[PDB]
């Protein structure tokens, strides 16, 4: 199953549902007892996250899913300085 993530400027990012569960914020929107139709929600609009940041975030999902149990060389995650601060805002707003 795939879920859909809309950025602040309207860009649509479709990632695997299992990967999007990395974010703590996204997890509470997509999983739970089902009282609020979380297990039937497959689309999330982020007014808070621009597209160039949300694109980095979605890579981070697929990056954390592969190199999580492999004790092989964990590859460096490129974070350009211009995006550096802005990406921490999205990561704090999402993770945990």
């Amino acid at each position: 199953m795939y879920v859909k993530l809309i950025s602040s400027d309207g860009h649509e990012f479709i990632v695997k549902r299992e990967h999007a569960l990395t974010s703590g914020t996204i997890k509470a929107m997509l999983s739970g007892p089902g009282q609020f139709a979380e297990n039937e929600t497959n689309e999330v609009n982020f007014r808070e996250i621009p597209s160039h940041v949300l694109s980095k975030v979605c890579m981070y999902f697929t990056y954390k899913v592969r190199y999580t149990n492999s004790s092989t060389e964990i590859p460096e995650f490129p974070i350009a300085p211009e995006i550096a601060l802005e990406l921490l805002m999205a990561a704090n707003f999402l993770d945990c």
């Binding site: 149990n69 492999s70 004790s71 092989t72």
Partner: protein, 155 residues
């Protein structure tokens, strides 16, 4: 035990592969005929050490005479190094706990070339034998995060 799953992946303990080629490093500058005698006498001599290096790394399985060296929880055995089984070869056995994963290492060295091979094996008995199930408390501390837990101080 969840340790069996952590064995399935490749190179769970760094620099060590599930199968690997080993050499007898030692007296690298001396002639080969002298090395074959140095390694053969070392396995037989009563207070001699033999070590084998995994090729491409600086990681080594060090075999010690029990009467001259000890360790916290390592238990001496007489059959970990066996020569007189097969003429021209020497087999090796090494039980140890690597990253909370109980393993058994088995390998051999050719007496004329001083080269060999070996691979790891799972020891599900030692996992049951290890008490208090602190190996699952160990794995907890390995997955913990400290990056934002300390409380700031402004003075």
């Amino acid at each position: 035990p969840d340790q069996r799953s952590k064995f399935e992946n490749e190179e769970f303990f760094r620099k060590l592969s599930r199968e690997c080629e080993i050499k007898y490093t030692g007296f690298r500058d001396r002639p080969h005929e002298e090395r074959q005698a140095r390694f053969q006498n070392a396995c037989r001599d009563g207070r001699s050490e033999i070590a084998f290096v995994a090729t491409g790394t600086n990681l080594s399985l060090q075999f010690f005479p029990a009467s001259w060296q000890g360790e916290q929880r390592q238990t001496p055995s007489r059959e970990y190094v066996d020569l007189e089984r097969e003429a021209g070869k020497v087999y090796l056995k090494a039980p140890m706990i690597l990253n909370g994963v109980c393993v058994i290492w088995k390998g051999w060295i050719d007496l004329q070339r001083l080269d060999g091979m070996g691979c790891l094996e799972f020891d599900e008995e030692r996992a049951q034998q290890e008490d208090a199930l602190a190996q699952q408390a160990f794995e907890e501390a390995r997955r913990r995060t400290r990056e934002f837990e300390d409380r700031d101080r402004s003075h």
